[PDB]
């Protein structure tokens, strides 16, 4: 979104945004200033005619807290790879999971949706994850036009290394964000004009900690079946996804859901003067939970609008109307049941 | 200011500095290497004839500690807003308080003065603060030429969220850096040529934590009345500020002063070969302290010089001559009474 | 490696890399994803005919862990200084020690070698260190053509300031990363064409903490004698270093070695299609250890290759074959005795 360097086959696109955001909620753990900013580089070098190396980095820096505070910045994306002209591409690092190739069609809300809802960050291959080799391929080895296919492999990421251990690595992490040797695949196709369909499947080994430290979720493998449909035409965005996860959807902080049925659907209209009203519904029903029965993990209706000044400046307002009923599951799992109203003005370069 | 991008009405300025700095002092909590660097972007996009969107970000990175060290970087500024041609501007994020619109006239020392002295970072609206909606207006609605006035509103920033609570928010902070819903206004005018006067007023509700956890300072509202006069002409810089704060000036680490009288005054001369000697006096007399009574919170005379090679490179040396007498107040408040000698060489892009 | 701004005597180079890296090892404290990225600026300003100011900054950002993790970024380099055209240069900040001016000729391995092996970060003047004033001089005061000489002084960097103290500073650090008032000098000369020789000497005071808290290493001064020989021509790189350190080489985590003999030797061939196989041997034999005696601190054989697509993209594989025998010294010092295999694809801008 801003190419600051272009010389001798090297281009360096420097992109990002400064989002001044504020939340209103009864939940005083999200209430207050939420002003953040993202910044990153997006460079590539040309090697020959049908070979181009590239790298990307996306850094997230929070700016709603004081300078006395700690751990206020992290790396969202960081990978490097090669482009084989048309035969596809290959990249490795911290990148989006292949399941996202479908789920991203509903991550189009003014502020909400996406991470922290039906899926989350470091949740196997459902979003951003560490050490993922992703082979993407445009137009299925040239065979089928418009058929974008992808394969992904993820390395084992266990607990913090030390005495006690149990499948440790150098990048040891919290119990809910671990993952074993996993793989995944995505597949998107434009069936008609403006209409697209997609499918994604992921399977990762689970570690001992995810069957021990937390109470919810027991099983050897974590699987995700994902399907999506997107209509983007006539100033209409209308998308829906659906995911059946097995030992893979987070149940707050208690563990994982042995069986989960995520479902997102969003509708937006784009005006000619720059107003984009958006209405969505997200739900995630968890089945066969250890202890509890069949419970709702997430359920809310979104409504809001985004006013676009131009390709760089915008402002937005969002309303999460939480439909979750307070029961014994949300009390100990720590799942919020309160409505939230977001209000933001973001500059974007 | 090194403008690295300018294309199609969008500009991206990239500014900052790398200050290699060293302190000499009896206070062994500031003596030693102090090498820091700041870096940030200053971009803007043009929307229409009388509307321009902009954003700013300023990042501070310390470089005096080892690679093992923690919490060595923070965000000084990060906001986004709109400039209405002549009718003014409106911005939201982490920005400078309106009181700084005046007191900054004495934050012109080779290294000392300004933040961390009479006021500090996140000290209500006296300096940098989180979540401030600032409506500035150049030339008083076109009515009065040269009268720059500003209005500011600040959202509630409480304690860490959890059990116990007491007015919490998501950006919860230490008791001395909290603030409730506050407002403020500034007013600066160049009466003659080179002579300027200024006024600033801030009023924020104080939170329960600031009347409980720390001992000094009790009250419901925190107010700051500030006035300043600056003469900048004929190679003469001569400025003075003065602030009466009520439940707003930090008394080191003990709390706030129920009544405080901050006063800074600085005089500098600019030579033709790039040498700028500077002499200042900063004091902060605290009145009505719980226990201690009437004590001095800060009191020192500054003397030093800055040699400017050009508009980008410079070097400086400073001498803080602390006039504070050692008593029980400085012992419990953690207020330093020792002289400091700064010595720096700064590259600036 | 990418000059984004160059106008009116000011140039602003923007360099760095995005290294997607993965380790395989029995030692499950280094195994797993290691994807890191470095990014920094390399600017300079022109002052007059024989005076040019410059500044440099190098930031290391880890991206192998989750966003929940802490302390994943640090500053490798950050300094500012003046270039006297040809008469030399002077810079201060966090910069490379003068001993590296020699040892860097063997830190040319595909991934391993350098920091964390025979020397380390913040290990007196053997690598990067805080608060170093470095006066370099190109072509020895005009006397001798081609003779690069350097002098460096380092300020005292002790423990964290507080009650108890014992030589404290504001940038207080871990016991093994401390350093007193030190100095050093390096001297490199190209004797033949492609053949170079170099010598370096450093002497720093040790603090009370390094003779008290840890058991190994006793003495008042820490000294390093370093010598190096480099042959770089005819697609042949062949270099060797040798260092006798006294109270200066780390003996893992037990303290310092009263006598250490570091020795590195590397041989590489550069093909015409971009393959650079490299074979090296690094060892560090420690003599006169408190309690143990004569032990091996480091000893392994390196073998690997770096395939260069071009000057920006590359991929590599490395093999650290550890020759260390398991004994009580490696048991208490925490020194790894396991083989490691690195595998990386790095974009470089």
Residue numbers in the entry:
A (entry chain F), B (entry chain B), C (entry chain A): 0 to 348
What does the paper behind this entry write?
Carbapenem-resistance in Klebsiella pneumoniae (KP) sequence type ST258 is mediated by carbapenemases (e.g. KPC-2) and loss or modification of the major non-selective porins OmpK35 and OmpK36. However, porins play important physiological roles and facilitate both the influx of small hydrophilic solutes, including nutrients, and the efflux of toxic products across the otherwise impermeable Gram-negative outer membrane. The overall structures of OmpK35 and OmpK36 display similar features to other general porins, a trimeric architecture composed of 16-stranded β-barrels. L3 is not exposed at the cell surface but folds back into the barrel, forming a constriction zone half way inside the channel that contributes to the permeability properties, such as size exclusion limit and ion selectivity of the pore.
We chose to study an OmpK36ST258 variant from an ST258 strain (KPST258) that exhibits high Carbapenems MICs, which is associated with increased mortality. In comparison with the reference laboratory strain ATCC43816, the OmpK36 variant includes a Gly115-Asp116 (GD) insertion after the conserved Pro109-Glu-Phe-Gly-Gly-Asp114 motif in L3 and a Leu165-Ser-Pro167 (LSP) insertion in L4. The OmpK36ST258 structure can be superimposed on OmpK36WT with an rmsd of 0.43 Å over 340 Cα atoms. The structure suggests that L3 is further stabilised by the formation of a salt-bridge between D114 and R127 at the barrel face of the pore. Diffusion and resistance assessed with these methodologies were similar for both Ertapenem and Imipenem. These results suggest that L4 insertions do not play a role in pore reduction, in unison with the structure, where the LSP insertion results in an extended loop conformation that perturbs the top of the barrel (away from the constriction zone). Meropenem (383 g/mol) diffusion was significantly reduced in OmpK36ST258-containing proteoliposomes compared with OmpK36WT. We infer from these data, that in OmpK36ST258, pore diameter reduction is a trade-off between Carbapenem resistance and retaining partial WT functionality.
